[PDB]
Design a protein around this ligand. Structure first.
Ligand SMILES: NC[C@@H](O)c1ccc(O)cc1
Ligand code: VO4
Length: 425
């Protein structure tokens, strides 16, 4: 398996659909390595739940929680952690308004080496229960023979890139993790790292983060040959008064770079209503009426969540993916799993007549490029050499009576899977 791309286990589907799937407990299990220390980067944390996900033997090993919480939220997190002497916190600086620390990553230091996990799940029970989520698992990275001179770098520059990502935090607790990564051999990594970090970026620095980073990698490591762009996410930012302010102008331009139809996949109200969770799935699809009403133009791009190939049409997506399928959707030029949803906050937005890239948030994803494997394209695995696309193709357009799930309005005409209505507030 060259890709090491996995979905999370979903409770309540036929076990066959969970065969190659992972729960966080599987990830932290002793069969993955003898744990010594870990860092957990995320957005939301349920600390009591998280510690229980670690096997009993590892539960007292040091854990660093990297979060973006401030004021009262920060206090509450510290209070969650207090009882556990082995836990430290690292508050990521968020100097730009409306930024979040949205990156989901595990750094897992073992006796036998190091593992990096980049994924899409918050560290709370419900994100790992009945949602479609994605996981990329690094190989076990060995320690560099303490008497030899090697970089431990990969052809995709993953090691240097992960170090620069962590360096942007400017955090003393992460310097230790940076030093740990220096000591390991990451040369077998076959993915590219795509990060977002809060800032306003100029000149050559534009290339470093967000959609400009993606554009840079597609220019340098893909070649060009009507191949659609597919975007799939669980949160939707304010994108502007029309398609030309951002979506089709700078965003699409990066995504269609190589060496044009745009499909966006986002649950309809009907997808949510009939899900395994019912309407409360919508708590994790925070598209607000205030944003939506400003941009009804976007919704003609929307397509339903459908995942029969992975038995997950009823498991609402919290995964975010972007990809470039051929016109018949039988193959792809690339695939990206990331924490970046569809917002300027996550991807970057051009300022000052296009000389400055403004990003609000921390985001992190891995890009699968066929060149990194010696190929020109990946064949799509039609049933979850060939890439495991976790939802159905081609994506199905919204019906005329479909609406995008919008979390802060009520749905009371029809009950959900559990016989409940949704009345937020
Ligand atoms: N802000 C907490 C909750 O609304 C939430 C948290 C994370 C998500 O990805 C979506 C929703
Ligand atoms: O955790 V959020 O998409």
């Amino acid at each position: 398996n060259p890709f090491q791309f996995y979905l999370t286990r979903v409770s309540g589907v036929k076990p066959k659909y969970n065969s190659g799937a992972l729960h966080i407990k599987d990830i932290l299990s002793p069969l993955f390595g003898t744990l010594v220390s870990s860092a957990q980067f995320n957005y939301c944390f349920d600390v009591d739940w998280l510690v229980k996900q670690y096997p009993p033997e590892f539960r007292k090993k040091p854990i660093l929680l990297v979060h973006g919480d401030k004021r009262e939220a920060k206090a509450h997190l510290h209070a969650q952690a207090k009882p556990y002497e082995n836990i430290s916190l690292c508050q990521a600086k968020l100097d730009i308004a409306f930024g979040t620390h949205h990156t989901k990553m595990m750094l897992l230091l073992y006796e036998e080496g190091l593992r990096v996990v980049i994924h899409t799940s918050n560290l709370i029970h419900a994100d790992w229960h009945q949602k479609t989520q994605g996981i990329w698992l690094s190989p076990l990275y060995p320690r560099i023979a303490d008497g030899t001179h090697k970089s431990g770098e990969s052809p995709t520059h993953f090691k240097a890139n992960l170090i620069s990502y962590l360096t942007a935090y400017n955090a003393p607790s992460l310097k230790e993790w940076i030093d740990v990564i220096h000591k390991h051999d990451l040369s077998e990594t076959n993915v590219y790292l795509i990060g977002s970090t809060p800032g306003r970026f100029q000149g050559s620095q534009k290339d470093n983060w967000g959609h400009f980073r993606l554009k840079k990698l597609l220019k340098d490591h893909a070649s060009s040959m009507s191949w659609p762009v597919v975007g799939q996410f669980s949160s939707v930012g304010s994108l502007g008064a029309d398609e030309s302010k951002w979506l089709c102008s700078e965003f699409k331009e990066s995504m269609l770079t190589l060496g044009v139809p745009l499909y966006l996949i986002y649950p309809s109200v009907e997808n949510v209503r009939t899900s395994l969770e019912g309407y409360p799935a919508g708590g994790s699809l925070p598209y607000s009426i205030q944003t939506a009403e400003k941009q009804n133009w976007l919704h003609s791009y929307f397509h339903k969540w459908s995942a029969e190939t992975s038995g997950r049409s009823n498991a609402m997506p919290h995964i975010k993916t972007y990809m470039r399928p051929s016109p018949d959707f039988s193959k792809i030029a690339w695939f990206l799993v990331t924490s970046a949803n569809l917002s300027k906050a996550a991807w970057g937005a051009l300022e000052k007549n296009g000389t400055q890239l403004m990003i609000r948030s921390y985001e992190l994803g891995v890009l699968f490029l066929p060149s990194a494997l010696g190929l020109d394209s990946f064949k799509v695995k039609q049933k979850f050499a060939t890439f495991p696309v976790p939802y159905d193709l081609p994506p199905e357009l919204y019906g005329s009576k479909d609406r995008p799930w919008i979390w802060n309005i009520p749905y009371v005409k029809a009950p959900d899977t559990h016989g409940n209505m949704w009345v937020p507030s």
